[PDB]
Design a protein around this ligand. Structure first.
Ligand SMILES: Nc1nc2c(ncn2[C@@H]2O[C@H](COP(=O)(O)OP(=O)(O)OP(=O)(O)O)[C@@H](O)[C@H]2O)c(=O)[nH]1
Ligand SMILES: Nc1nc2c(ncn2[C@@H]2O[C@H](COP(=O)(O)OP(=O)(O)OP(=O)(O)O)[C@@H](O)[C@H]2O)c(=O)[nH]1
Ligand SMILES: Nc1nc2c(ncn2[C@@H]2O[C@H](COP(=O)(O)OP(=O)(O)OP(=O)(O)O)[C@@H](O)[C@H]2O)c(=O)[nH]1
Ligand SMILES: [Zn+2]
Ligand SMILES: [Zn+2]
Ligand SMILES: [Zn+2]
Lengths: 446, 446, 446
C-alpha cells in the first residue's frame, strides 16, 4: 500500500519497515536516485503524518512545493522554488480534467488568484513566508526545512491556530554536540563546516595533491578551528547550505513555552527515528501550564559517535570533531573487544570483519575505529584512576576560586539504548519575491 | 485478548507474558515507539487492575488524562495536560454517536459542566488536584505518576473512601539505595541525577570533546558529589523531571499508618514486578490495627546492581554509584566465575560471551562487569578476613565511645531470589489551573 | 483435581507432587506471585488436612481470614486483618445467591451478629483471639501463624475440645539451631535477624556503598553479635516480623504434656515436609499417660546447612551463622569431592557445574560452598586427630573441676536421610480490637 523508490535488495528496506510498522513498505525502484533512502523515509513520514491527523484538517506545508502535495485528499496550504512552482502549475494543467477528486479545479482557481494578486491567501496555496502568511490552520508540516528559526516559525503558526506541527529532517543531535563535520551514512548524507570543506578524509570534502614544499601564507592567524555557523549538507549529490543556529533551534526540548501577545505551551516528541532521520511531533496549546526543564533528550537506537579526528585541510594538518551513526548490531558486536585497549588498526580490522554486503558504510569505518580505540583507551583510564565515592579534588588557586583538572575526552560514544541530554532554551519571547516573467510563465500554463 | 504494541520478535514479549500469565499477550506492533516495552507493561497493568476490581467501582485516575480512559466500561473519574485534555475532547467528539456503550454522552455532558464551572466534581472528570478533588470513590490508580507525595495522596484518597489503590511505575528500590544514576535497560530507560548529566559513560548523559588543557575554575568548592533531590528520567526519548523524596515516598513499607482527622491502616504489596517495572497494590482500611515494622522489602527476580563507577562529569574525573538490572539468566551464568577474583576486562568478555540477540543491553555490560569484578574481590576479602563467631572488634577512643572499621563496599549485588530491605517511615501524620483560551478551544469541539 | 498457581515448567512441581502423592497436582498459573511455591504448598496442605479430618468436624482456623475459608463444605470457625475481613464480607455479598451449598446465608447472618455484638461466638466466625475464643471445636488449623506461643494456644484449644491440630509453616529447625540468618530457597524465602539486616551477601539485607574511610562510632560496645528475638521473614516480597521464642515454641517434641486445670498428652508429628515447608499434626488427648523425653526430631530429606559466614553489616566485617537447604541430589553429588579438603572456590565451581535450569538457587551457592569446604576440612581434622575408644582427655584445673577442649565447628551439615535432634521443653504448665468505621464498612456491604 506504500511504495518506496528503492532497490528491492536494499538493506535499508528492513530499517524503514521497522521505522514504519504500520505500513506495508514495498520497494518499487523507478529512479537511480543517490539519496533514495532519504526520499523514501520522507515519503513514509508524509504518509504517516497524513494517517495521524484528521481528514477535515487544513495543513500548512512550510518551505515546500505544492507539486508534491497535489495528489492528496487533504487540504494542503503550501506556504514557503520557481521551478517547483512551474512544476506544480504543470501538474495542475496536466490533470485538470483527468481526475476531480483532489479539488484540482479549486487549486487551479486558487493559483490563478495568487498570480493575479500575490497577497491573496487562497485556502490551498500561498506565496508568503511562514511568518508573512496569515491563512489559519491547525496542522503544520516542516518537511526537510532547516533554514527557519524553530520557535519563531512555531509561534507564527500557533497564533494562526496551529495546534499540531510535524518536523521531518535529519537528527539535530550532531549539531548540539557541535561536531565539525559528520555523516548520516544510511542516507548517503555528509555534512561539513565550511572551514573543513578542503579536508581529505571526511565525507564531504575536496583537496588537491601537494608535495608540501612551500608553507602557505595567510593574512590572518587561525590558531583556532572550531565550528562556525555555516555548514554544507550533501544528501546524495544534493547540496544544501544550513545555519548551525537554525539547525540547533529545531533541537527542541520535551516542553517549552512561547510567550508573546499569545502564550503557548508546546511539547516536542520524536515519534519516528531511523538512523539519523527523525520525525518530530510538536503539540502546541495556548497557555503557560507546567514548568520547563530546558532539556532535550535524544534516544539512540543506533550508536552515535563524536570523535576527534586528524585530517589535512588545504594541506594543513588539523584536528576536529566528526560525528557518525554506527549500526546497533556493529556497536553490540564491539562490546567485548572494547573491554581492553585496542589499537585503531585492530579495531578497523575487526569492524571490517564484522561488516561482511556491508552493514555500515565503509568510508566511516576508519574514523569509527579510531573513535572506538580512543573510547576504549579512555575507559581504561577511567578504570585506572578510580576516585573516592562522592568526593572531588578541586584545588584552591590563590583566591576563593576552585579549579579541577579536565580529562582528555577525544570520543563521545552514545551506545544503542542510551540517551543524550542537552541543556537548551525552553522559554522563547523574542520572535514579496514574485517576478513578472514567472507570473507570465505560470499563467501561460493555466 | 490483550494486544501490545511491540515487535512480534521482541525478547521482552516472553518476560511480559511471564509477568501477566492470566492474559494472552499478543504482539501487535503499530508504532516504532522507542519506549514500547514500558507502554506495553502499563497497558497490561491497567488491564489487570481493571480485571481485579469490581465492575461497579468508581476509579480515581490520579495524574493522568481521560484521553486514554474513555474506551472502558468502568467509571473512571480522571483527576490530575492541555494537549491531553484536547485529545480527550477530540476522542469524545469523534465517537459521540458511533459507540454509546461507554457513557460518552454522559462524559461529554460532564466535560461541558466542568468547562462551565471549573470546580465541578462530575463523576467522570475533574480538573482539581488529587488533594483538591472531592469526588468520592473506592479505587485509585496511580499510573506512571511520581511527582506526588505518596502518604499525602493516599490519605487524601482514603478520606474520600478509597480502600484500594494501584501504583504503576518504575521500581523505587534504586532510589532507596541512593544511586547517582541508573538504568531500567529492559524499558530503554535511563535516569540520572542532575549533577551527573554531563557524564560520558552512563545511559543518560552528554559530554563534549576536550583536550584537558585548561583546568576549569569554579566559584564554589564541590569537594562532595552526593545525589541531590532533582533527577531526570528518560523513557525512550521521553524526558521527565522527578524528585528523589517523592520517588522514595512511594517505596512504602508492607504496613503503614496514615494518622489525621481519620486514621487508616494501609498495606503495600508489589503484585507485578517485571525487570524494573512494578505494579503495587495498596489496601487502605480505617483504623489503626496492628503495628508497623517500618521495613520495605523488594524481591529481586533479576539481579540488582549498585556499583561505584568512575566517569568524567564535565571533564572532571569523579566516582559515583550507578544502578542497573541484570537478567537472572546472566546472573546465574556468572555464579561460577565470581567464585574467584576476576578482572573487569575478563568479566566483560565473559558477559559478552553470555549475552550472545542480546539478553541484556550491551551499554550496561561494562559497568556491570566492573560491579561483578568488585563484588568478587570484596567477597574474597570477606573470605580472607574471617572473624570470630558472635564477636566484634570495636575499639575505645579516649572516652565511653566505641568505633569500628568500615570496609570498602564498591558493589551492592542483590542476586536473583534475594530481597532488599529498607528502613522507611511507616507512620504518617504530616499531610485553579484553567485558562480561557483552553476553555474556548475545548468548547469549540463540543 | 488440585490446581496450583505455579508455572507448568516449574521444577517445584515435581517436589510438590512428591510431597502430595495422594493428589493430582496440576499447575494452573494465574498470577506472577513471587512466593507462588509457598502458596501452592499451603493450598495443598489445606486440601490434605480437609481430606484427613471428618466432614462433621468444626475447624478452628487460628490467625487467619475467612476470605479463604468459605468456598468449602466444612464448618470453619475463623478466630484470629481489616482488609481481609472486608474481603471476606465482599465475597459473602458477591456469592450470597449464586451458590447456596456453602451455608453462605448462615455465614452472613453470623457475620452480621458478630458485627452487632463483637463478643458473639457464632459457629462460623469469631473476632476474639485464639485465647479469648470460646467456641468449642475438635480440629484446629494453624496455617502460616508463628506469632503465637505454641503450648499456650494448643492448651487453649484443647480445653475447648480440640483433639487434632494442624500447623502449616516454615521448618522451625533453623531457629532451634539459632542461626543468625537463613534461606528457604525453594520458596523464595529469606529470613534474617534484625541486627544483620544491613548485611551485604545474605538473602534479606541492604547495605550502602562506602569507601571505608571514616570509622563509624557507637555509644555502646557491641563486642558480641548473637541472635536476638526479633527476626524478619521475607516470603517473596511479603515481609513478616517474628519472634525467635515463638518460632521455637512450635518446634514441639514428639510427645509433650500440657498441665493445668485440665491435663493433656499431646503428640507432634511432621506429616508433610517439602524443602523447608512443613505440615505438623498435633494430637491432643486428655490425661498424662506416658513419659516425655523432651526431644524434637527433624528428619532431613534434603541437606540442611548451618555455616559460619563472614559478611559486612553496616560496613563492619563480622561473622555469623547462616542456614540454608541444599537439594538432596546436590548433596549426594557432593559426597565424593568432600572426602578430600576442597577450597571454597573449587567447591563453588563444582556446585555450579552440578547446578546446570538450576537445581538450587544460585545465591546460596557461595556460602554453601564455604560450608561444604569448611565441613570437609573439619572432617579431615577429625580423621587426623583420632582419639581412643571410650576415653576422654578432660584435664583437672586446680580443683575438682574438669575441662576439655572444644573444637572449631564452623559447619553443621545435616545430610539427606539424617535427623537433627534438639532438647526442648515437653512439660508446659505456665499458660476487643474492633473499630466503629470498620463495623460500618462491613455492614454497608451486608
Ligand atoms: N539538509 C537538507 N536536506 C534537504 C533539504 N531539503 C530537502 N532535503 C533532503 O534532500 C533530498 C533532496 O531533495 P530534492 O532534490 O528536492 O528531492 P525530493 O525532495 O525527493 O524531490 P525531487 O526533487 O522531486 O526528487 C530530499 O529528499 C530531502 O530529504 C534541506 O533544505 N536541507
Ligand atoms: N519517570 C516517569 N515516567 C513516566 C511518567 N509519565 C509517563 N511515564 C512513562 O513514560 C512513557 C512515556 O509517556 P507518554 O509519552 O505519555 O506515553 P504514553 O503514556 O503511553 O501515552 P502516549 O503519549 O499516548 O503514548 C509512558 O509509557 C510511561 O510508562 C512520569 O511522570 N515519570
Ligand atoms: N514468616 C511468615 N510467613 C507467612 C506468614 N503469614 C503468611 N506467610 C506466608 O507468606 C505468604 C504471603 O502471604 P499472603 O500475602 O497473605 O499470601 P496468601 O496467604 O496466599 O494470601 P493472598 O494475599 O490472597 O495471596 C503466604 O503464602 C504464606 O505462606 C507469617 O505470619 N509469617
Ligand atoms: Zn498563505
Ligand atoms: Zn474530580
Ligand atoms: Zn470465636
Amino acid at each position: 500500500p506504500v511504495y518506496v523508490d528503492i532497490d528491492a535488495d536494499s538493506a535499508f528496506l528492513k530499517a524503514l519497515q521497522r521505522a514504519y510498522p504500520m505500513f506495508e513498505v514495498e520497494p518499487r525502484q523507478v529512479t537511480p536516485n543517490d539519496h533514495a533512502n532519504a526520499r523514501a523515509f520522507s515519503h513514509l513520514a508524509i504518509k504517516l503524518i497524513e494517517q495521524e491527523i484528521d481528514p477535515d484538517s487544513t495543513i500548512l506545508d512550510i518551505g515546500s512545493a505544492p507539486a508534491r502535495r497535489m495528489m492528496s485528499d487533504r487540504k494542503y496550504h503550501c506556504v514557503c522554488d520557481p521551478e517547483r512552482l512551474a512544476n506544480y502549475a504543470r501538474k495542475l494543467a496536466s490533470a485538470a480534467g483527468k481526475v476531480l477528486d483532489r479539488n484540482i479545479s479549486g487549486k487551479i482557481g486558487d493559483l490563478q488568484a495568487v498570480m493575479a494578486v500575490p497577497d491573496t491567501e487562497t485556502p490551498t496555496f500561498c506565496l508568503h513566508t511562514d511568518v508573512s502568511c496569515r491563512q489559519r490552520a491547525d496542522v503544520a508540516i516542516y518537511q526537510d526545512v532547516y533554514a527557519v528559526h524553530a520557535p519563531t516559525s512555531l509561534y507564527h503558526q500557533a497564533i494562526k491556530g496551529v495546534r499540531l506541527a510535524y518536523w521531518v529532517g535529519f537528527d539535530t543531535t550532531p549539531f548540539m554536540y557541535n561536531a565539525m563535520a559528520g555523516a548520516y551514512p544510511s542516507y548517503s548524507t555528509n555534512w561539513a563546516d565550511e572551514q573543513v570543506l578542503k579536508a581529505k578524509n571526511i565525507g564531504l570534502c575536496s583537496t588537491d595533491l601537494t608535495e608540501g614544499r612551500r608553507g602557505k601564507l595567510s593574512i590572518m592567524r587561525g590558531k583556532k578551528l572550531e565550528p562556525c555557523d555555516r555548514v554544507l549538507f550533501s544528501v546524495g549529490s544534493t547540496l544544501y547550505p544550513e545555519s548551525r543556529k537554525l539547525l540547533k533551534s529545531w533541537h527542541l526540548p520535551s516542553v517549552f513555552h512561547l510567550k508573546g501577545k499569545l502564550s503557548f505551551t508546546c511539547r516536542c516528541d520524536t515519534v519516528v527515528s531511523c538512523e539519523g532521520y527523525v520525525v518530530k511531533r510538536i503539540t502546541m496549546s495556548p497557555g503557560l501550564y507546567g514548568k520547563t526543564t530546558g532539556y532535550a533528550v535524544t534516544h539512540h537506537a543506533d550508536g552515535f559517535l563524536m570523535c576527534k579526528t586528524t585530517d589535512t585541510v588545504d594541506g594543513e594538518r588539523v584536528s576536529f570533531s566528526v560525528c557518525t551513526y554506527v549500526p546497533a548490531t556493529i556497536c553490540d558486536q564491539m562490546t567485548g573487544i572494547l573491554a581492553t585497549e585496542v589499537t585503531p588498526e585492530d579495531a578497523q580490522k575487526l569492524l571490517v570483519g564484522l561488516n561482511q554486503t556491508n552493514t555500515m558504510k565503509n568510508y566511516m569505518i576508519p574514523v569509527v575505529a579510531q573513535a572506538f580505540s580512543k573510547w576504549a583507551k579512555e575507559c581504561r583510564k577511567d578504570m585506572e584512576d578510580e576516585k573516592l565515592l562522592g568526593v572531588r579534588e578541586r584545588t584552591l588557586t590563590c583566591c576563593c576560586l576552585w579549579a579541577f583538572k579536565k580529562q582528555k575526552t577525544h570520543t563521545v560514544y552514545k551506545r544503542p539504548d542510551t540517551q543524550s541530554i542537552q541543556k537548551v532554551q525552553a522559554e522563547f519571547d523574542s520572535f514579496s519575491g514574485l517576478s513578472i516573467p514567472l507570473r507570465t510563465r505560470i499563467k501561460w500554463l493555466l
